[PDB]
Structure formats: C-alpha cells, structure tokens
Structure 1
Amino acid sequence: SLWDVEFAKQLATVNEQPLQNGFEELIQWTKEGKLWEFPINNEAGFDDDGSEFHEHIFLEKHLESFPKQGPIRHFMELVTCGLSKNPYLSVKQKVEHIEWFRNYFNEKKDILK
C-alpha cells in the first residue's frame, strides 16, 4: 500500500499542470471541497452521528429510575419537554443534562419529601 501511495503521488505530480479556465479553477476548488455544495441543504455535514427524532424527543426510556407521580417526575417531565422542544442541542447534550440531574438529586436523596 505504501509504495503504491508513493507511485500514486508521483503520477499525480506528473499529471497536474497550470490550468486555463475559471471553470477549471472552480473544478479545483470543488475537488478540495472548499466551494459550497449546490444544492445548499445547509446540512452537508453536521449529521449529529445519525441521531434519530425519537431519540431526541422521547425521553421515556431515559426516565426509568423514578415513579410516575412524584414532584421529581414532574420536574423531569418538564425538562424532557423543554429538551425535545429545543432543536439546538443534541441527544448527547440532553443525556448529559439528564445525568447531571440524576447525580444532583441522588446526592440530595437526603430529603425525599
């Protein structure tokens, strides 16, 4: 593989030559990818690791370690609501919020009132 790459870069250095056309300059810009991707989806890249809409919105599975009626359940339900409403932050941010809240009230388990 290595010597194949050396020979390939040699062949390239033999290939490349001074261009003649602004279209060729654009072809070069698009070869390195600096020129934008028409059609502009505004999302070419930043895929969020193939995350899922239900993974974002439905936090029912992330909410398992508390009953259905308590005030902690109330607060965490409203938290999941606001998080699903927020598109700006991803599943990683939502789960770190949730786990920080978990640590918070698990260290403050002294009350449970």
Structure 2
Amino acid sequence: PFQNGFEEMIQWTKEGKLWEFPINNEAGFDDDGSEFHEHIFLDKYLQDFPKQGPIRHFMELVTCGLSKNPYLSVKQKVEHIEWFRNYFNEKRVILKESGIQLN
C-alpha cells in the first residue's frame, strides 16, 4: 500500500516505469558499447579491395558516408561493406570485361 504520492513516484522509478532525472535523452540506449573510432574510421573493412582502382573511389564515398551516419550502429555498416565485397566479387566477369582489371 502507498503512504504518499512520493512513494508512488519512488516505486514507479525503481521499477523503471517512471523517467530518470535530470533527463538525458540517451538513457536506456548504450549503443552496443561502441566508440567513435569504431564508427568514424572504416579502414578495417577496406582492407580487402583493389587499392588504386576506382573501386576505392566508390568505396571511399561509401565509407565517408557510413562515417557521417548517426542513424546506424557498427553492425549494419559492416553488413553494408560486406554485402559490397560479396557482390563485387560475385561478378568477376563484368569488372574484367569493362576494361579495368579488378580484384
């Protein structure tokens, strides 16, 4: 049973039902434990790719894009660059036929 309105608030807050004060809009979202150099620098996944080719032009724009992006975590960005590796290597015939030898 409740002794006071403050008891109400208190119990709602322990229960995690009532909000946390002074409010930080980031309360309850940890973002996977990540830090900026896991977000900003995508070199890690640019390791496997032809280095002097235009594929690095395209993938550097993709990279610089995924860097500027608050809306996605580490995981999905990585899935992007991985789907790109998988698809670029998926077609070996096109890259070579186009007039540039591409790895």
Bin for the TM-score computed over the shorter chain: 0.7 to 0.9
- State the Cα deviation string for residues 63-106 of structure 1 (Å, max 9, x = none): 11123321111111100101111111111010000111111111
Other structure's SS at 2:94 match: coil
Rg comparison, structure with higher value: 1
Other structure's SS at 2:92 match: coil
Structure 2: state its 5+ residue gaps.
Answer: 97-103
Query: Deviation at 1:39?
Result: 1.7
Other structure's SS at 1:103 match: helix
Q: Segments of 4+ in structure 1 off by > 4 A?
A: none
Higher relative contact order (CA 8 A, sep 6+): 2
Residue 11 of structure 2 corresponds to residue 28 of structure 1: yes
Query: Deviation at 1:49?
Result: 1.5
What is the TM-score of this pair, normalised by structure 2?
Answer: 0.87
Query: Deviation at 1:20?
Result: 2.0
- State the Cα deviation string for residues 9-68 of structure 1 (Å, max 9, x = none): xxxxxxxxx112100000110110111111211111221211110111101111111233
Match among 51, 54, 57 for residue 68 of structure 1: 51
Which stretch of structure 1 is more off in the superposition, 96-105 or 58-67? 58-67
Other structure's SS at 1:112 match: helix
Structure 1: state its 5+ residue gaps.
Answer: 1-17
Residue 20 of structure 2 corresponds to residue 37 of structure 1: yes
Q: Percent identity?
A: 92
